[PDB]
């Protein structure tokens, strides 16, 4: 309201490629979190339910980070068998 317009969440179009601007804009709002925040603000999320969701999202991150860290550590061993026949 009291801020200047056409600065925030504004993306300019290059060579009439509007699709790329909208994909770029939608990627800025998702990385910042506005998209999911706008979807969770449509209906009131009770504190107890919001605390149950934050824990699930934090435990999934931990697991997915370690699972990914092991996949990148063991991808060196995805080469051909050097002792083929033994």
């Amino acid at each position: 309201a009291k801020h200047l317009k056409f600065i925030a969440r504004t993306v300019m179009v290059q060579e009439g490629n509007v699709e790329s601007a909208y994909r770029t804009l939608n990627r800025i709002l998702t990385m910042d979190g506005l998209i999911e925040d706008i979807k969770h603000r449509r209906y009131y999320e009770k504190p107890c339910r919001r605390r149950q969701r934050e824990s699930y999202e934090r435990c999934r991150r931990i697991y997915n980070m370690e699972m990914a860290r092991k996949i990148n550590f063991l991808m060196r061993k995805n080469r051909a068998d050097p002792w083929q026949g033994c």
């Binding site: 925030a8 993306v11 509007v18 601007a21 506005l34 706008i38 603000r41």
Partner: peptide, 12 residues
């Protein structure tokens, strides 16, 4: 012709 795309979705 669209030169810019601004998002002004109300977020409290």
């Amino acid at each position: 012709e669209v030169i810019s795309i601004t998002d002004n979705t109300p977020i409290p």
